[PDB]
Amino acid sequence: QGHCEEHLDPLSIYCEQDRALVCGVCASLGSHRGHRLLPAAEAHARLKTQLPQQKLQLQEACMRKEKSVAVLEHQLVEVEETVRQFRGAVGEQLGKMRVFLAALEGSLDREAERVRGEAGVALRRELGSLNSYLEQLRQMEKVLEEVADKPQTEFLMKYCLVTSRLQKILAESPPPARLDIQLPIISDDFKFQVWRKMFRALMPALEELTFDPSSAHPSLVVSSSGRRVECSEQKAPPAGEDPRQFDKAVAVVAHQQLSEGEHYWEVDVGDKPRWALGVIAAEAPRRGRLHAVPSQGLWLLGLREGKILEAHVEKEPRALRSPERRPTRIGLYLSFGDGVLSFYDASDADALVPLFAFHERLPRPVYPFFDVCWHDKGKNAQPLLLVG
Amino acid sequence: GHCEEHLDPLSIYCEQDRALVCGVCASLGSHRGHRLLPAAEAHARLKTQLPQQKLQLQEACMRKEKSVAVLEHQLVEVEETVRQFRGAVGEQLGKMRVFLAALEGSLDREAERVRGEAGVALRRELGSLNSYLEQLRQMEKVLEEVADKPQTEFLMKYCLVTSRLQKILAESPPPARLDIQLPIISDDFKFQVWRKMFRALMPALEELTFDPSSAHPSLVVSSSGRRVECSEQKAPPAGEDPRQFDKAVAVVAHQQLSEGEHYWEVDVGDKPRWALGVIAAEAPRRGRLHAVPSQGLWLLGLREGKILEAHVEAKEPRALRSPERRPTRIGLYLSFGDGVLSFYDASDADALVPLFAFHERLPRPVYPFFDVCWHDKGKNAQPLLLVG
Ligand SMILES: [Zn+2]
Ligand SMILES: [Zn+2]
Ligand SMILES: [Zn+2]
Ligand SMILES: [Zn+2]
């Protein structure tokens, strides 16, 4: 046909604006009256040359659709990954407690069996003692029935053996005892008692930790085992060869750098009366007397006179309510994910009690830092020990 | 039937050695100085013993067969009590096992939901993008095939192709990111789930209803016994029965608590003065009541809306460390078995906080006691509600 629907005249015109073929009348009185126009010939010539370029536009469009269908198929996997990571991480955290539970129940069930079997067999022993006795009394009744009708010489020797044997049985006979099994007492407090213990069980395994003697204040000696540090009363040859060496702080940091995750490590303080535990930022300065404040790179807990605890927070420290018994072991929890450094009185591993927690984004990495302090003319002689 | 050491007839019997001997043997030193008896008289004397001796034989034989019974019974009593233990741990430990299982299931169900929802979100936008691509590629095929065509059919194909591309370039957005809201699973998760577990340990909240017949005349109990307030109403001056409080504006519950474990929560809102706890049953309720355990009053009290006190045995009540958030619901744990009454800031059930706990043998029975305190001309008008 190649003609107009509305007018039936050859579509010899092309409208540059509406980009569609039109007929003569359409340009004259039609909706295409005032538009920018071209003859079909010049329009065919112009678009022959364009066609590689239009062909390229379509491919640019196809690329951009193919690019977007890529992003979605990647996302469609990231969903199953993120769900697995979540659904997996949950099971793992819960698994800590589930294990703790099964461990505790096993330990009790083993003490159940131990008392069961052990108290069990003492009875089966004394049971045999009574069956042999009854069986002996049974024969003695049988002899006594047959002896009533015996010759003089035979009756007499039987009755002596019988009455003299029954004599010995009566002194050898023990009175029965009542059943007394000592099983662990299971109270109303029980469900709480386990719950309290679960806290220690939530923590990650104690970080492998060893003092760095190459950071040690000269008066400080580190044990060969790498887990004991002491403040000696002897002359100290100072060494300013390394900026990591402590000169005025009387302290030492650990070998291990801490960069990500969650870590827990306990420190036995015993009856030491002045010390400070915590962590140091890596590039923080170690030379001179340092004010204990996080802005100086110091996340620090210190004890004075063995009775007053203080948290070296952002000049004056915060005096913590001293626990009812002086603590003999401190725990340090550290999580970069959550930006937290928690201190615990770990003297009783079954009942951990928090003392204080920093709650800020920490600059990673940090070094477990330990301030032994001066032996103070013989008084602060007690060592610092790493539980492990 | 004669003596071994020499052939002489045993017609002699020795009362001391209780053994037949021969004549020579009574003259021989082996049995010489002993008290002796003829064998005939000994046979006559022991014939009469035989009825009495037979009774002695069975007299002991009876008590031994009964004693093998008591011990044979103990062998099951041991296996039963051990089972009772092993069962008892299962239940208390299961109390956490169920909690943990359920929390996992709830999280597992929300994750699956978020998963499937994103599942169709992408597969939808995906399927649409492909259909665009399939038509977009189809258009390339038109553009190659038509390049050599006559003017009129070529041109209208170029219009039709470019006009479809017109619409497609409008309907589709840039790739855009993946948006999943999952609960954030941090290192802190195991800790929050642990705290939440605490409240789950407590027994089901006691059915408790205020007993209006104990009530101070100026307080009205409403809502099926679970609401009391002190209204500024016409108050009958007092009742006659000692069961009614006349001076303290207080009310006890109907229910008597005599044995076991009990947990009940009391919504206090921003009521600024109150006292919660328990009163011994026959302990006095008439007159000004001094708050001390020796008078049957175990009480945790709030004053000025900010200071909590523990009415322990002293002249002045004991000022508690008040938490940084005003408590809006108080919890009460009770065990006669362990002799404990525990107060908790139960404002947030996922994290109960201990407030104070008495640790003494409790007089049974006891009444949940509630001191509303005077309405103070409109200030302390707020009620006490029992959660359930
Ligand atoms: Zn036309
Ligand atoms: Zn037009
Ligand atoms: Zn003889
Ligand atoms: Zn004799």
Residue numbers in the entry:
A (entry chain A): 83 to 396, 398 to 471
B (entry chain B): 84 to 471
Sentences from the paper on this structure:
After extensive optimization, we managed to obtain relatively well-diffracting crystals and determined the structure of the TRIM72 dimer at 3.0 Å. In the structure, we observed electron density for TRIM72 B-box, coiled-coil, and SPRY domains (BCC-SPRY), but the RING domain is not observed despite the fact that we used full-length protein for crystallization. The overall shape of TRIM72 BCC-SPRY dimer is similar to that of a clothes hanger. Residues (122–230) form a long α2 helix which in turn forms an antiparallel dimer with the α2′ helix from the other molecule. The short α4 helix (residues 270 to 283) again forms an antiparallel dimer with α4′ helix from the other protomer. Both ends of the coiled-coil domain are covered by a B-box domain. The two globular SPRY domains sit above the coiled-coil domain at the midpoint, with one on each side. In the TRIM72 structure, the α4 dimer packs tightly with the center region of the long α2 dimer to form an X-shaped junction with three layers of hydrophobic interactions. The SPRY domain is not flexibly linked to the coiled-coil domain as generally believed, instead, the SPRY domain of TRIM72 formed extensive interactions with the α4 helices. Zinc atom 1 (ZN1) is coordinated by C86, H89, C105, and C108; zinc atom 2 (ZN2) is coordinated by C97, D100, H114, and H117, the use of an aspartate instead of Cys/His for ZN2 coordination is similar to what has been observed for TRIM5α B2-box. One direct result of TRIM72 B-box dimerization is that the C242 residues from two TRIM72 molecules are brought to a close distance of 30 Å, possibly facilitating disulfide bond formation.
Human TRIM72, a tripartite motif family protein primarily found in striated muscle, consists of four domains: the RING domain, B-box domain, coiled-coil domain, and SPRY domain. Tripartite Motif Protein 72 (TRIM72, also named MG53) mediates membrane damage repair through membrane fusion and exocytosis. During injury, TRIM72 molecules form intermolecular disulfide bonds in response to the oxidative environment and TRIM72 oligomers are proposed to connect vesicles to the plasma membrane and promote membrane fusion in conjunction with other partners like dysferlin and caveolin.
